[PDB]
Amino acid sequence: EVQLVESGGGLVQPGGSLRLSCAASGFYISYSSIHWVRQAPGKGLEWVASISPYSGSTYYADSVKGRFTISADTSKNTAYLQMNSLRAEDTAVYYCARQGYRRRSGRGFDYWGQGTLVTVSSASTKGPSVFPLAPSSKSTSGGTAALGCLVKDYFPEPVTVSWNSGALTSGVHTFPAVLQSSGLYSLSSVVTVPSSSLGTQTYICNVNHKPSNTKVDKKVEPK
Amino acid sequence: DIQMTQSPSSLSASVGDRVTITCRASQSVSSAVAWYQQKPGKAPKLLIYSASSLYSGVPSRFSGSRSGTDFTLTISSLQPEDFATYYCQQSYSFPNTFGQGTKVEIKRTVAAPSVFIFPPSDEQLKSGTASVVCLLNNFYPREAKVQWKVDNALQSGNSQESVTEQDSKDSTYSLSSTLTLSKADYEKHKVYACEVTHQGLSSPVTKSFNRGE
RNA sequence: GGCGAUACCAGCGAAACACGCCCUUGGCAGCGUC
Ligand SMILES: [K+]
Ligand SMILES: [K+]
């Protein structure tokens, strides 16, 4: 029933600007406080701003006061976060959250959106190179084989990696990306399969990097 | 600003254990304190509001209490699905503030890694770079030493590691170590090896390959 | 323990502020004083 859907995120330069939207469904925002909360990758939740019902009063974290503006349009049932003078430290997933009804859950934030990723960086977009990680053993060895794909030199996050168009999920490990000294990301995705399936079963890694409009399928065969 | 000082920053607990997470507000916040659960890759969910009230639908093993400006979240008996990062938050005054979080992971028995090594692809080598990948699969605990040796020489400063989040069903981890070298550097040596030390192994395990061979 | 003057928390309206209603009672806590 209750849904919050953030949008508007993307990659921008330091000093740039971006406007996020949070579309509410299943309730009317005019009777609720609405909050923005952000989360840098692998870091904690950070409260950003909020707007109060009836008054429209607004509040901001010290770290964004003067640069960000929260607003709402009750006729669109949507809330907004205009972000200006952006800096690298603003990079984060931005969540929209509803503060619940006072008599039901106090001031707890009872519904959260899925968030929208904002990346602030001077680095240019670049799609990945995809290379096979050839099966670790022979088809006739009787045990388990590991195989995978190296997804190297891309920016910004995220890429998605599937195997056999999503049909292969069991035993898949797609590792968190790490930044190389070049400032570009790299990761590997691996899977373990029965050695006896090599040959019979075809293994393809499907890599999608929407920020660069890049899609790659790479077959991974025995060497 | 009111600081929320949350402790510990991480903990590894067994299923069935009682887990206590604490948050001290730097000045009075009355009872305007909420607790959230956030699983990796997911949005936070509300557990407790107004310091001690259970949010509707939340299991009763979760409870909160207040002693002055000290706020405690207790899980009376940790369940397997309870791994997550937990956050306290004050709503007494603006700006609202979150604690730094407590990452709760599941303790399990020791498990040694299965080790695999991958030479660089011929397609990569033509581009002038060689990535060699070592995979440590399904082990516990997370701590591990991975050491690269090229023709028996210890390598340093040319490799990076990545570790997965704890597996939801086997509570293990996996890790990748990638050694990067130039094509010329790669082609000046023959034996590439990855030596793994882990407390589940009685002695280090080496996987290697011989270049070209 | 008494007395005195206070300082803050609070009911409801879809509601932290603002706006409307209700209320003159409760509650911790310090201070002053015997
Ligand atoms: K509300
Ligand atoms: K404003």
Residue numbers in the entry:
A (entry chain A): 4 to 226
B (entry chain B): 2 to 214
Text of the article:
There have been increased efforts recently to “drug” RNA using orally bioavailable, low-molecular-weight compounds. This study combines two of the most powerful tools of modern drug discovery, high-throughput screening and structure-based design, to target the theophylline aptamer, a tertiary-structured RNA that binds theophylline with high affinity and selectivity. That structure revealed how multiple interdependent components of the RNA form a well-defined ligand binding pocket that enables theophylline to bind with submicromolar affinity while excluding closely related compounds such as caffeine (which differs by a single methyl group) by more than 10,000-fold. Previous biophysical and modeling studies have shown that the aptamer undergoes a large conformational rearrangement upon binding theophylline. X-ray crystal structures were determined for the aptamer, both in isolation and in complex with various ligands, revealing the molecular basis for ligand binding.
Therefore, not surprisingly, initial crystallization trials of the ligand-free aptamer were unsuccessful. Two different strategies were used to obtain diffraction-quality crystals. The first involved replacing the GAAA tetraloop of the aptamer with an AAACA pentaloop, whereby the pentaloop structure is tightly bound by the antigen-binding fragment (Fab) of an antibody that is cocrystallized with the RNA. Using the Fab cocrystallization strategy, the structure of the RNA aptamer in the absence of theophylline was solved at 1.81 Å resolution, using the Fab as the search model for molecular replacement. There were four copies of the complex in the asymmetric unit, with the majority of crystal contacts mediated by the surface of the Fab. The individual nucleotides could be localized, even though the electron density for the RNA was lower than that for the Fab. The RNA was found to exist in two conformations, each forming an extended hairpin, with most residues in a stacked arrangement and the notable absence of the theophylline binding pocket.
